């Protein structure tokens, strides 16, 4: 009774857990009440219960601080009971742990403990370990003496002592600065998939022994360097408790014949002795490259040695082998056959939300000024991975240290806690770091759920509805499609003038569907054409299959024709290497994988007609320049982010901008805003954009689509009926 499954929490606070209301009613506790949690090895913790809309009924959400004190791990089950008789304490004694008090001195109580407890009203228990962050350090403390027992709430009027040497960490507890799941920012969906594959075989092996099902024995993670492939593998081992063995290709490959095989085989034998265990092999493509791509005896044999060691995992109880590579196709295909490494996860590049999450994780210890805006940084850090975002946090800290701290402290290993806590990092320090850092994964395609919604698109009311019918209905109402024998379309192509919202349309439908958006641009199709590397098309479509549900957007479909001369070219046809592989993958893609393909072009007259046949991009939507009411809607939408003066006549502007595209109306709105900002700045050397700013902006803005192009687009659309 009163048993709940331990899982991760959204609320990071050291005294807060979250329950779903049905359990709060059965336990007869209310929001804000204090409860006791009973874990393992006669260990207990005291906390406050809140509620949210994310915790499931059978789970209790708690952070690492609570799980460590209870000596429990994710996937375990604990008992919960209310304790309404909790009162305030009188005197407590709290001391830091030596594991974190290194390179630091001074009055750690005034810097850490007193801000932590003062007006905090936190419930504590004797022996509780908790982490206090600040001054770019994370210091954990233990409660060693209390007058009340076994728990109390620490009020601002209580006496807190902190005298004595730092306490050595006990073997029954883990350091709170160790790598866990809360250290992983982006790619959280991928971590969830891995947890489902790994947590249960290791946490509850009795269920897999008793039930006729087979556990995964090998998971391949792939993506650019610096995305967290090695961070995930270690975090999983730390959270589950499995022994972590580290292997890397270059080291094993550097060894001579007989040495590389012995070292690789030994690591597997050690994992069995230390089972449950996880073996992580980094740079899998280096330790086991494709045999058909090498010539040496050592390279051919070491691949065979790994292949047989992986098969041996049927006898090595509770051993899971993880591996990391840059590309799933850079390793010997035998590794990916049934068994061995039969599971793979696409880590890729963190999305806009994940990048912010990573910046927030690597600033937990940093004291930030009020002007610091990590969301703005995350939006500008395109192409950056966790390794680069962590670099930004360290570099911004170094700028604060060289300005202030290096004028205070000596050339030594010890700094006073007060000096560290007095140091804050400003927006100028993050801006400097941003200009110095260079993304390590800017060339690879980034896949993410877009933030564009339907409210961001002016006009095109019928096109927005059309995409909902093409993408949402086939999966929201599948019984109607079966009833009438409907065959969903696999994709749609947009054509017409540039700058009318084609990109927003593809993103907006992906947004509402909560589907991943894969953006492929002309330069990618041009590179494949000129480099005779059309095989990369298959990887693009394969990502769409693994990222499903997703929308796969192929922009600038005309770029293939341009590569061969475009308007003139040679005497051949429209078919070529790149488009042929694209058509092949399209025909081999089923609507059952919830992948919808969208194309776009500004030159539909030179698109290989094959792509428009039934089964491909059979649907054609014309996106003309916005009409009178749409241009007003576009101007109004772009101004949602700033106050607009009552003298601004949006209809007058739309009447003048008869030949303008949506992209050009945006420049007018943005220019008028910048002009209003310029005046605002000057007034301090204004609260809204005035009519004068729009009229001035009209003097610089021009239409991007000429009258000759408009007639060409309209005549083409008319020809198609």
């Amino acid at each position: 009774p009163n048993r709940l499954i331990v899982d991760e929490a959204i609320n990071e606070d050291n005294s807060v857990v979250s329950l779903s209301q049905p359990k709060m009613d059965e336990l007869q506790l209310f929001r804000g009440d204090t409860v006791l949690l009973k874990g393992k090895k006669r260990r207990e913790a005291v906390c406050i219960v809140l509620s949210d809309d994310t915790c499931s009924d059978e789970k209790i959400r708690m952070n690492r601080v609570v799980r460590n004190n209870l000596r429990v791990r994710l996937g375990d089950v604990i008992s919960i009971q209310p304790c309404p008789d909790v009162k305030y304490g009188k005197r407590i004694h709290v001391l830091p742990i030596d594991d974190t008090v290194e390179g630091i001195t001074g009055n750690l109580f005034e810097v850490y403990l007193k801000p932590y407890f003062l007006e905090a009203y936190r419930p504590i228990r004797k022996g509780d370990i908790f982490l206090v962050r600040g001054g770019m350090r994370a210091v954990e403390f233990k409660v060693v003496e209390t007058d009340p027992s076994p728990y109390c709430i620490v009020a601002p009027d209580t006496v807190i002592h902190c005298e004595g040497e730092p306490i050595k960490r006990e073997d029954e507890e883990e350091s709170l600065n160790e790598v866990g799941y809360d250290d992983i920012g982006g790619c959280r969906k991928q971590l969830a998939q891995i947890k489902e594959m790994v947590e249960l075989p290791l946490r509850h092996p009795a269920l897999f022994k008793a039930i006729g099902v087979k556990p995964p024995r090998g998971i391949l993670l792939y993506g650019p360097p610096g995305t967290g492939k090695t961070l995930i593998a270690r975090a999983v081992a730390n959270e589950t408790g499995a022994f972590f063995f580290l292997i890397n290709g270059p080291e094993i490959m550097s060894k001579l014949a007989g040495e590389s095989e012995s070292n690789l085989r030994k690591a597997f034998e050690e994992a069995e002795k230390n089972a449950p265990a996880i073996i992580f092999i980094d740079e899998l493509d280096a330790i086991a490259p494709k045999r058909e791509k090498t010539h040496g005896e050592v390279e051919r044999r070491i691949v065979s040695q790994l292949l047989t060691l992986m098969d041996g995992l049927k006898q090595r109880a509770h051993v899971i082998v993880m591996a990391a590579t840059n590309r799933p196709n850079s390793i010997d295909p035998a590794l990916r056959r049934f068994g061995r490494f039969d599971r793979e996860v696409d880590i890729g590049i963190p999305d806009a939300t994940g990048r912010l999450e990573i910046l927030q994780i690597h600033t937990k210890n940093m004291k930030l000024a009020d002007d610091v805006d990590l969301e703005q940084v995350a939006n500008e850090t395109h192409g950056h991975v966790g390794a680069d975002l962590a670099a930004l946090c360290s570099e911004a800290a170094l700028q604060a240290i060289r300005k202030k701290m290096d004028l205070i402290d000596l050339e030594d290993e010890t700094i006073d806690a007060e000096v560290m806590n007095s140091l804050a990092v400003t927006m100028d320090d993050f801006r400097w770091a941003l200009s110095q850092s260079n993304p390590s994964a800017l060339r690879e395609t980034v896949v993410e759920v877009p933030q564009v919604t339907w409210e961001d698109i002016g006009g095109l009311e019928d096109v927005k509805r059309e995409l909902q019918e093409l993408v949402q209905y086939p999966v929201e109402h599948p019984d109607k499609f079966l009833k009438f024998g409907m065959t969903p379309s696999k994709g749609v192509l947009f054509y017409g003038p540039p700058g009318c919202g084609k990109t927003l349309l593809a993103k907006a439908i992906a947004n509402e569907c909560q589907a991943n958006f894969i953006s492929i641009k002309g330069p990618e199709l041009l590179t494949m054409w000129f480099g005779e590397s059309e095989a990369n098309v298959r990887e693009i479509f394969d990502k769409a299959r693994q990222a499903a549900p997703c929308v796969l957007f192929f922009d600038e479909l005309d770029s293939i024709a341009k590569a061969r001369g475009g308007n003139i070219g040679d005497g051949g046809g429209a078919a070529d290497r790149v488009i042929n592989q694209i058509l092949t993958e399209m025909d081999g893609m089923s609507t059952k994988k919830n992948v919808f393909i969208i194309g776009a072009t500004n030159r539909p007259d030179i698109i290989d007609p094959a792509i428009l046949r039934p089964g491909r991009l059979d649907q054609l939507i014309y996106i003309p320049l916005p009409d009178e009411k749409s241009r007003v809607a576009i101007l109004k939408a772009n101004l949602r982010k700033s106050p607009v003066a009552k003298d601004v006549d949006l209809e007058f502007l739309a009447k003048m901008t008869n030949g303008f595209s949506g992209a050009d109306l945006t420049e007018i709105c943005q220019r008028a805003c910048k002009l209003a900002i310029r005046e605002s700045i000057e007034s301090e050397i204004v609260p809204e954009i005035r009519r004068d700013h729009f009229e001035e902006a009209m003097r610089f803005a021009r239409r991007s689509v000429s009258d000759n192009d408009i007639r060409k687009y309209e005549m083409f659309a008319q020809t198609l009926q």
């Binding site: 990071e12 005294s15 204090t34 809140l50 007006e119 905090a120 009203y121 936190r122 419930p123 709430i153």
Partner: peptide
């Protein structure tokens, strides 16, 4: 009881100020 509700008000204020 009342000391627990004051602990909840302090913990909730910390979470909302940092998360919002």
């Amino acid at each position: 009881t009342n000391e627990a509700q004051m602990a909840a008000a302090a913990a909730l204020a910390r979470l909302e100020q940092k998360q919002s």
